[PDB]
Design a protein around this motif. Structure first.
Motif: not given
Ligand code: ADP
Ligand code: ADP
Lengths: 365, 368
Positions: A356-357, A360, A363-364, B362-364, B366-367
């Motif tokens: 995924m890009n 990342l 985050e997980l 993408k990121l927000i 799980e942000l």
């Protein structure tokens, strides 16, 4: 033991490749050279003993000419000055950057001149008039299992290159009958001999380059070291000699992707057979060093037969392969990477670095 | 999807027509401000309806007169606000023949409708917030539905006996339905918007009938796609967070009985097609209003290209507004009643609107 130091030089992109924007397929992770085909299919991984990343001058671990020299060649000099034999093989396809590594240009010199001048410098430092040195060299080639001399004045006529033959001396081992030898005192008197030989070395135009190498070449430097004991009895009798062999090998060249016939075909077959036997020899030497005694098929080729005493016993061997990182030569680079290898090459699939890009998973976590 | 945005309904009473003055028609629709009362002329039965908003363009000088710009500033401007926030928005008209839907949406050169004001206000709001942090990208399309076929309004035809090249509709698993081959044009200013609109309205199909000498005989969808590319406080790449919004403004055709506007042939054919599409739309509205009351219901989106391409607006994910347009003539009381009934039924629709961050998964995600 007597191990075999295999090394690889990844040439950097050239101007033609940068203009055509030829993409990169050979990458490094430190202790591994990896090949990722542009289709992102079977990803090959090779673990060698030393990797020379000459790809980008600002990357960590940048392999300069001096770096390569101090890494591989200088231990062979230190070994030669102990009374033991050394051999340096150079393998690579055409355009992979083999001459750059061995000889060098007017600037950024290579292994040949670096080794020669450092050898002479250490000789000067060790000169006392109690210890003396003598340097005698020769230069020959192998073509269809026939030996030819490269330092002989020859005219133009048909079938002029007179073939010599190998012979086995019971103590000194194998040698070439009738091969000339010449004495030297510097590098400026080596260059003019090498430039005479490399013009008589066999070449022919093929689908890879209009001037390719089609014969193996051996440059042998014989050092004799004389000592004297102060007991007033050993008058100039303590002699120990050493041989440094520098061997330019020709490429494999597949006859499938080059429709050929006649002399070029014969040359390819002979070169191929020689390379196969050399590989068998190196692998068997590796097994011998790792403990299991085996039989080395020295006798199945003129090259190995002549270099027998320089690839066994108390000796040191190094093999410098040269490979290009462009995607335009996958088959040759993989052929040169599969060849120069003692351990097992591993293959996987690694297109999943695009999970995924830029994963990342930060985050997980 | 943590929201529930109720579909906002409006009503507009148009003034008496040339036809409805030649025939001595009476007045049967009245207002008391916010409610709308309708009376049968027989003095038998009265009905009342209540909506979120109600406009009164029956007479210029009356009290409560809601002109073109007042209708705009009451309905379309909040849709622009949500479009800048990051939501998809839809505004669609409804009504019988000659109600004044094309007038209310597009309008005349001396009375610009909702579209030439929406796009202009959009560009003006951009000119005040086109700072260094955020940039904007605007695309437009304008397509037509005619005999259940899709046509592009913003191309210049060839020259033949047949120069209406039909496109087809497709279903993308994530983005939903769309049109294959539709020219989406990048826009820079309101003048370019106006040029494209002029071309499209000149290409749109029209005809003289017994109720509109310039009739709107094809459904028209006007799509804007607005992308706000903003920048976080970054150690690396700037301009790294984008939000998209689709604005769909829809002018539909009217019912039209075949006997009143007596005409045979192609007029009858396209009237039949229009009628079918309107029937399917009514079924969809009723089914969604029944979903709102907790029942398991199936929405017939696929029975017509109109609802199929508007699947994400009548329900789905966007903030939707409806404009019913009605006539006060007593001769059209039945159609006025049907329109008002479907409109008040539409108020019960609830759509789940979300912000199109393009950052979820993408990121927000799980942000937060
Ligand atoms: N470390 C390096 N940095 C930059 N260029 C290199 C390097 N090594 C080799 N090259 C390039 O490789 C070229 C030599 O290729 P060539 O001699 O034709 O192949 P081969 O050595 O197999 O005959 C040189 O022109 C040189 O520019
Ligand atoms: N509020 C209004 N003020 C002035 N004229 C109106 C108004 N509403 C409707 N009309 C008239 O109704 C006619 C038809 O409107 P239009 O939008 O074309 O109907 P349709 O729904 O058939 O497209 C227009 O010629 C217009 O002048």
């Amino acid at each position: 033991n007597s191990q075999v130091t295999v090394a690889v030089r990844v040439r950097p992109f050239s101007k033609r490749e940068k203009t055509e924007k030829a993409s990169q397929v050979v990458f490094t992770n430190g202790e591994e050279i990896t090949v990722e085909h542009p289709d992102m299919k079977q990803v090959y991984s090779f673990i060698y003993d030393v990797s020379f990343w000459s790809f980008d001058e600002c990357h960590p671990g940048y392999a300069s000419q001096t770096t390569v020299y101090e890494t591989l060649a200088a231990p062979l000099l230190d070994r030669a000055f102990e009374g033991y034999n050394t051999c340096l093989f150079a393998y690579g396809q055409t355009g992979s950057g083999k001459s750059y590594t061995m000889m060098g240009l007017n600037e950024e010199p290579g292994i040949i001149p670096r080794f020669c001048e450092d050898l002479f410098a250490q000789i000067a430092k060790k000169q006392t008039s109690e210890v003396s040195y003598h340097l005698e060299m020769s230069f020959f080639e192998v073509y269809n299992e026939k030996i030819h001399d490269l330092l002989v004045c020859k005219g133009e006529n048909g079938q002029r290159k007179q073939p010599l033959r190998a012979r086995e001396h019971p103590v000194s081992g194998p040698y070439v009958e009738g091969l000339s030898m010449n004495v030297v005192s510097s590098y400026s008197d080596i260059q003019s001999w090498l430039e005479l030989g490399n013009k008589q070395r066999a070449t022919a135009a093929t689908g890879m380059n209009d001037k390719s190498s089609r014969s193996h070449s051996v440059f042998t430097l014989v050092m004799t070291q004389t000592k004297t004991e102060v007991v007033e009895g050993e008058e100039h009798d303590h002699r120990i000699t050493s041989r440094i062999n520098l061997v330019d090998l020709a490429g494999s060249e597949r006859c499938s992707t080059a429709h050929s016939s006649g002399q070029r075909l014969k040359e390819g077959v002979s070169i191929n057979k020689s390379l196969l036997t050399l590989g068998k020899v190196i692998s068997a030497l590796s097994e011998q060093a790792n403990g299991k005694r085996v039989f080395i098929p020295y006798r199945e080729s003129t090259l190995t037969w002549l270099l027998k005493e320089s690839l066994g016993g108390n000796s040191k061997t190094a093999m410098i392969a040269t490979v290009s990182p462009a995607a335009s030569n996958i088959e040759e680079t993989l052929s040169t990477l599969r060849y120069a290898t003692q351990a097992r090459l591993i293959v996987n699939i690694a297109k999943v670095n695009e999970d995924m890009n830029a994963k990342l998973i930060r985050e997980l976590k």
